[PDB]
Amino acid sequence: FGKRKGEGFGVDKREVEVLRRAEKLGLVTPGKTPEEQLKELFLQGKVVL
Amino acid sequence: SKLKAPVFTVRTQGREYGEFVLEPLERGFGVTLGNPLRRILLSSIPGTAVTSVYIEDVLHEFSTIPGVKEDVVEIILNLKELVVRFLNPSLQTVTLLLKAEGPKEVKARDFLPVADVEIMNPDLHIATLEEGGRLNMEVRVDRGVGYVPAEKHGIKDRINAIPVDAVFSPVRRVAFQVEDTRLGQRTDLDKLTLRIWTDGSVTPLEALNQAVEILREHLTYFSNPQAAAVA
Amino acid sequence: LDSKLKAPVFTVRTQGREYGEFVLEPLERGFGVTLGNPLRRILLSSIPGTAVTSVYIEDVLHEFSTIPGVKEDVVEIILNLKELVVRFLNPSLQTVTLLLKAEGPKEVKARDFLPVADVEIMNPDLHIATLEEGGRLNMEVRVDRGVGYVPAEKHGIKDRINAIPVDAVFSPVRRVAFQVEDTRLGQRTDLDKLTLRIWTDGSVTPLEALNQAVEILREHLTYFSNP
Amino acid sequence: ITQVRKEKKGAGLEFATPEEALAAHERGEVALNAPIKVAGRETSVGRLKYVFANPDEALLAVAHGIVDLQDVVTVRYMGKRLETSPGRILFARIVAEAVEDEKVAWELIQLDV
Amino acid sequence: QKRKLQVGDKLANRHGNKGVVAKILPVEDMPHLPDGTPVDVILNPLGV
Numbered sequence: 001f002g003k004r005k006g007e008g009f010g011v012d013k014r015e016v017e018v019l020r021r022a023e024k025l026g027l028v029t030p031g032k033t034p035e036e037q038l039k040e041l042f043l044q045g046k047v048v049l
Numbered sequence: 050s051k052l053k054a055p056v057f058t059v060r061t062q063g064r065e066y067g068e069f070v071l072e073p074l075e076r077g078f079g080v081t082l083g084n085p086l087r088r089i090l091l092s093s094i095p096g097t098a099v100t101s102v103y104i105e106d107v108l109h110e111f112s113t114i115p116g117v118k119e120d121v122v123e124i125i126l127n128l129k130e131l132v133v134r135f136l137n138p139s140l141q142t143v144t145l146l147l148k149a150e151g152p153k154e155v156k157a158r159d160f161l162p163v164a165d166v167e168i169m170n171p172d173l174h175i176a177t178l179e180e181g182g183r184l185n186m187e188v189r190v191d192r193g194v195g196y197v198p199a200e201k202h203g204i205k206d207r208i209n210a211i212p213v214d215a216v217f218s219p220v221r222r223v224a225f226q227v228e229d230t231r232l233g234q235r236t237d238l239d240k241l242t243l244r245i246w247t248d249g250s251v252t253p254l255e256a257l258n259q260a261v262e263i264l265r266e267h268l269t270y271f272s273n274p275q276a277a278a279v280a
Numbered sequence: 281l282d283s284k285l286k287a288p289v290f291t292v293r294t295q296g297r298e299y300g301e302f303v304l305e306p307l308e309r310g311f312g313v314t315l316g317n318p319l320r321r322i323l324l325s326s327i328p329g330t331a332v333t334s335v336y337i338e339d340v341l342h343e344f345s346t347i348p349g350v351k352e353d354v355v356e357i358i359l360n361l362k363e364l365v366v367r368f369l370n371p372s373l374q375t376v377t378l379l380l381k382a383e384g385p386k387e388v389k390a391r392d393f394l395p396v397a398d399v400e401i402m403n404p405d406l407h408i409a410t411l412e413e414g415g416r417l418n419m420e421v422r423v424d425r426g427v428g429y430v431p432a433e434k435h436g437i438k439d440r441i442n443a444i445p446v447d448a449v450f451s452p453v454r455r456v457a458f459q460v461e462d463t464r465l466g467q468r469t470d471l472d473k474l475t476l477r478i479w480t481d482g483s484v485t486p487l488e489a490l491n492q493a494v495e496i497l498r499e500h501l502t503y504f505s506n507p
Numbered sequence: 508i509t510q511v512r513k514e515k516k517g518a519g520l521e522f523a524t525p526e527e528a529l530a531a532h533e534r535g536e537v538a539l540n541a542p543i544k545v546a547g548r549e550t551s552v553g554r555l556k557y558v559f560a561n562p563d564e565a566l567l568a569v570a571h572g573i574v575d576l577q578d579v580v581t582v583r584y585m586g587k588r589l590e591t592s593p594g595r596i597l598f599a600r601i602v603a604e605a606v607e608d609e610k611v612a613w614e615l616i617q618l619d620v
Numbered sequence: 621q622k623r624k625l626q627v628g629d630k631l632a633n634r635h636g637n638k639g640v641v642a643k644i645l646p647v648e649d650m651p652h653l654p655d656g657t658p659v660d661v662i663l664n665p666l667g668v
């Protein structure tokens with residue numbers, strides 16, 4: 001991820017939608033930043049696809 | 050309230066990598082434009098690859114050579130990584146001649162130079178030669194598109210030549226980012242960025258151009274409606 | 281290695297102004313979905329159309345109120361107003377306001393709306409409301425040109441205090457379906473057969489819709505031209 | 508596609524008029540699919556906020572990201588005002604188109620599960 | 621003979637998950653990561 005952040009790209013719209021979905025599933029905690037949530041998923045071995 | 054032509058930004062590093070930005074775009078057009086181009090970039094972009102290999106005193110792929118560490122299967126596996134750039138667009142095929150003896154580590158740079166032919170990866174390993182070890186090769190490299198297995202093309206120059214699996218696509222990787230953007234009082238607009246990694250044979254920009262051309266030409270196919278009579 | 285093959289034939293099947301089927305074969309591997317998806321996205325989102333964006337009814341405060349003398353509630357009338365298909369005869373025209381005043385026992389249709397210059401109503405037999413004895417309906421509807429789908433809260437337009445904002449269904453295209461089937465030409469077995477299915481409201485035909493859709497796409501491809 | 512969302516944010520708050528409910532949801536005080544009560548009858552914000560004249564509109568909205576197939580909502584289908592998800596409408600239309608009969612198909616399926 | 625993997629060939633992992641290759645997609649049809657990296661293999665979760 002950090003590689004991406006340095007490369008000059010922020011969080012994708014699709015990533016936002018998937019984050020909303022996962023937030024409804026109770027996979028990530030509400031209120032955290034997109035990066036924090038993506039990390040929360042990544043620790044569960046899951047990634048946006 | 051109709052959006053109009055977006056600014057188009059280009060960022061290139063060498064011949065290998067590129068980023069292409071289009072903003073602002075209407076909602077959903079990041080994917081609408083981005084994805085088809087990616088599909089075309091990964092598949093239909095023409096390029097070059099080794100289509101055949103002849104080695105002296107080698108009857109087939111299943112053989113080894115005295116003084117050479119790598120077997121022929123490995124030699125071909127290495128030659129399959131060879132990136133060959135053609136300058137003149139008219140040129141279809143080139144036979145690269147290599148003659149070497151050891152001890153030395155034979156690289157792709159050791160190939161005898163040809164007019165309007167540039168190896169984009171001279172440091173690519175080919176073989177490991179030992180005292181007394183002698184390697185003489187003729188490798189046929191062709192223009193082409195997509196993935197054509199050795200089984201399909203069966204290309205053999207001379208009798209003992211070995212057909213090689215050919216991956217023609219110059220494009221190594223394609224990704225596209227869709228970021229949130231705004232113009233004036235309009236929100237939820239798309240900012241599209243195409244990231245293109247190639248092998249150096251063709252630049253990301255060229256790839257993007259001919260990909261766009263392929264999609265355009267494909268859109269030209271809707272221009273001739275024909276009545277379908279099931280009755 | 282050698283590859284040379286013929287350009288695909290575009291096949292058209294059309295029933296009325298409502299529906300059409302579009303077949304494109306043969307295509308190179310994968311190109312069935314390469315063409316199909318963007319077109320579907322464009323056909324749904326970007327095709328120019330008309331919609332009812334606002335409604336005002338006499339003696340009616342909010343959307344969930346009722347109308348004395350009329351059986352349908354305000355909700356049900358707004359629904360029918362969404363199914364109203366209005367076609368603008370002139371490109372200059374952006375927005376119109378259509379007035380309807382009727383009473384006594386009647387069944388009000390879309391044809392009852394007072395005609396406006398360069399405004400055509402495609403579905404005159406569409407049923408807006410039924411009025412009883414003593415039933416009084418006086419209403420004005422705001423019709424705009426736009427694209428895609430805008431919920432009522434997003435545009436939120438009001439000409440006056442009692443005007444109720446309506447979900448704007450702009451898209452003349454009601455549905456788009458596409459399917460890719462494997463097809464073969466000679467010894468090429470991986471080729472694609474593209475089939476498109478488009479439902480419209482009649483204001484814009486499916487073929488017109490597809491044509492407008494592919495044009496939008498081509499025009500977007502020209503945006504990679506000058507940095 | 509045929510399962511519906513059950514949300515805990517609103518969790519049975521009482522409201523007088525649907526405008527108040529829509530306002531509460533607007534502030535983020537009530538989830539879209541949360542089982543609230545307006546005018547003494549149990550309903551949800553989604554049923555009030557989105558009322559579709561027909562399946563094509565509802566699925567068009569789903570296509571635009573306005574709602575999700577699992578959201579409970581109000582859809583007008585076959586002269587009936589239905590509280591259900593767009594997804595169940597989709598299933599209904601799948602069966603319907605498959606058998607080429609709308610009435611019989613409507614009779615065969617169970618929409619509410 | 622040099623045998624490439626083909627449709628109907630048997631694949632397995634060390635945990636007892638076995639399956640025959642039913643489809644070989646071109647790379648552009650493959651699910652991919654946001655960085656543009658396509659996956660190699662798609663295994664059905666229903667097998668777990």
Ligand SMILES: [Mg+2]
Nearest residue numbers: 309310470471
């Ligand atoms: Mg195919």
Ligand SMILES: [Mg+2]
Nearest residue numbers: 555556557558
């Ligand atoms: Mg509503």
Ligand SMILES: [Mg+2]
Nearest residue numbers: 613614615616
């Ligand atoms: Mg039933």
